[PDB]
Design a protein around this ligand. Structure first.
Ligand SMILES: CC/C=C/C/C=C/C/C=C/C/C=C/C/C=C/C/C=C/CCC(=O)O
Ligand SMILES: CC/C=C/C/C=C\C/C=C\CCCCCCCC(=O)O
Ligand SMILES: CC/C=C\C/C=C/C/C=C/CCCCCCCC(=O)O
Ligand SMILES: O=C([O-])CC(=O)C(=O)O
Ligand SMILES: [Zn+2]
Ligand SMILES: [Zn+2]
Ligand SMILES: [Zn+2]
Ligand SMILES: [Zn+2]
Ligand SMILES: [Zn+2]
Ligand SMILES: [Zn+2]
Length: 183
């Protein structure tokens, strides 16, 4: 809970909160059952009204079209859209992106790493189970996490990842404020 490292993470979360649009790439390793059966995605996101369109790997089927429209999270199988979940129902079920950052322990500045041609500050930390459950409802312990924060003046959250017991989730941002067509 180093105040300087926490401050730097808050800078990236505030930058994230201020985005009009962003491209998100989700990747996983091992076994992750907490993303409604999705294990990979590349998704264009519009922040307000929240809307998303892209592609995902769902139940091991690749190239599955993916959308968020209104309250619905949906995937297209063959010619048919089906709803995997509801935003409101997940929001009450699991419990904006300012998690209780106090609660985050053992912040460590690991130095500089280049991701997609961007120099980033790598900071590791430990996330309390209560916050981990928001991502993985079955989580029973505090888990290690990592964030990579651009050093270019933007404070972009270029990447964030969490090592869950059974697997890991990695989220990579790009295309900040580049226009998207999501409907
Ligand atoms: C090592 C310390 C870990 C601290 C916790 C890191 C939190 C990671 C948050 C994930 C990044 C957000 C997902 C990308 C989608 C961005 C769309 C913008 C809408 C969010 C606006 C809002 O929060 O109200
Ligand atoms: C890309 C894979 C999608 C799987 C997502 C399922 C779990 C997500 C983790 C917590 C969900 C937070 C719900 C969002 C809060 C409401 C946002 C809003 O209404 O603007
Ligand atoms: C420290 C945490 C690192 C893992 C990041 C979480 C990964 C995946 C869940 C977050 C949702 C990604 C955004 C996808 C579009 C937003 C609409 C939605 O699916 O809820
Ligand atoms: O919404 C999606 O991502 C898929 C849709 O069928 C398209 O326009 O290709
Ligand atoms: Zn310090
Ligand atoms: Zn992509
Ligand atoms: Zn995109
Ligand atoms: Zn059909
Ligand atoms: Zn789980
Ligand atoms: Zn930006």
């Amino acid at each position: 809970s180093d105040p300087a490292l926490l401050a730097e993470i808050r800078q990236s979360l505030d930058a994230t909160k201020g985005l009009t649009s962003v491209h998100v790439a989700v990747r996983t390793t091992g076994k992750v059952d907490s993303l409604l059966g999705i294990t990979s995605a590349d998704v264009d996101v519009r922040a307000n009204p929240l809307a998303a369109k892209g592609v995902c790997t769902y139940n091991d089927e690749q190239g599955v079209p993916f959308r968020v429209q209104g309250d619905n999270i949906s995937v297209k199988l063959f010619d048919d859209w089906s709803n995997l979940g509801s935003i409101s129902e997940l929001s009450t079920s699991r419990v904006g992106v300012t998690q209780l950052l106090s609660g985050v322990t053992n912040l460590q500045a690991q130095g500089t790493e280049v991701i997609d041609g961007i120099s980033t500050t790598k900071i590791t930390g430990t996330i309390p189970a209560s916050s981990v459950k928001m991502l993985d409802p079955g989580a029973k312990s505090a888990r290690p996490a990592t964030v990579w924060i651009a050093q270019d003046g933007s404070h972009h959250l270029v990447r964030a990842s969490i090592d869950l017991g059974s697997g890991s989730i990695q989220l990579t941002q790009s295309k900040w404020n580049e226009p998207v067509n999501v409907d």
